[PDB]
Amino acid sequence: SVHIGAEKGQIADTVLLPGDPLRAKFIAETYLENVECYNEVRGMYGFTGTYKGKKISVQGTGMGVPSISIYVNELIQSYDVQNLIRVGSCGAIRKDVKVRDVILAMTSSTDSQMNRVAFGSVDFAPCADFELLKNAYDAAKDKGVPVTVGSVFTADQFYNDDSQIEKLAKYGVLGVEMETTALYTLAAKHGRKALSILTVSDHVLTGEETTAEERQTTFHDMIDVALHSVS
Template sequence: MVKIKESELILNPDGSIYHLNLLPHQLADTVITVGDPDRVTAVSKYFDTIEFKTHKREFKTHTGSFNGKRISVISTGIGTDNIDIVLNELDALKNIDFETRTIKNKLSALEIIRIGTSGAIQPEIAIDSFSVSAKAIGFDTLLHFYKETSFLDTDFSKAFIEHTAWNAKKSEPYVVSADDELLKKFNSEEFIKGVTATNVGFYGPQGRVLRLSTEDEGMNNKIQKFNFKGAKITNFEMETSGIYGLAKLLGHRAISLNAILANRAKRSFSLNSEKTIDSLIKTTLKIISK
């Protein structure tokens, strides 16, 4: 067995994984990810019991139980760069023996559920509704750093590049699907099923203009009109493609849920954002604990 070097698998003095500050036994098999560290408490306040808490940098974790199901909720911060840290370290906690620094002979899969916030790109999507991402199209570069990405939907991404006249100086978009079993769990009237675009920024990359002009002022309109075999891009956010891609690579099951707080086509924003997020949290906990 090949021993993983200290510079590759970095552990803290107490033996916990470097960024997440977790020991293997402190992680549940079901993991809820949220962006904002404050949202960890917004989820765990509904737990029946909380057995463990830790917080390092933007990575805050509470592990406990809800209706008899053990769950860890962890904040990722913003962006797929942070997702690269979180997904790799979650997998290490599950599938690497920290004492021998070797990959376990029998690998195990985590169930990863993202509870996030998002802006709709289609005008008919109502503010304060919920979405579930059947697919994600990533405008980031993360998956291009890894091998064995044969699961990517290249026909979809090629059609998107052609439709939008995508600037080659930007990263090449990639498309990855949700876990089928988890998608079925959230196949209900409560969730709008669609395709999520994962952006590399909040302002220019999502077409927002304050003082800086964007490279393609018509990009959001092109995205809104894009249709691939009946599938439309429904919403913008900043993590889903990384979660889906790394989950596929590492053998985990992932789904991304969003509270729609803005409608970019209508230039409108929720007046009840905290209530909407809380409602999504309660709905999600109820579904995953069945």
């Protein structure tokens, strides 16, 4: 693997995928034990540790379909990763997505061309692994963590003069981020299991920025849900 400098067995079967390598660090150091950093290439830190005994990895993906695709492919093809769970944030684009909501994406729209490259005239609809999603949902409900299940939009252009998010909101899409289409497509293509869990970093359409206290409570809830999404 060209972008991960790790050996056999150093990466667990289950990998959390924050976008930010500094969040991978924070997650590993805060939630796991027996932490080893297995990757330093390009500063895209990957870590491996244990949670209640179980080997878990946490790997930064960087931003956008192309960056996450690199890491997901190597993780899957060279380290045989079976469960891939994005933990990151999105801009909410609907009023009924609350700042405290943990979002589970069932599927993801995109303006990436990756699927049209593969399918031409077909619209490929990526799809979360249902078992992972059902576990994550039940984990939230059992504790009373508020959870919303729906779809997201995977954007190529964080800054997009030709954005269609008002239309997307109207069709029921919950928020915008920059990875999920890739995660879900590449995972299912190789018989692996994918899910994205998201918290709300802002409300793109109305203006309202969240507060530090909100984001950090929900981030905690997200990770806790994640740590229970594999049975």
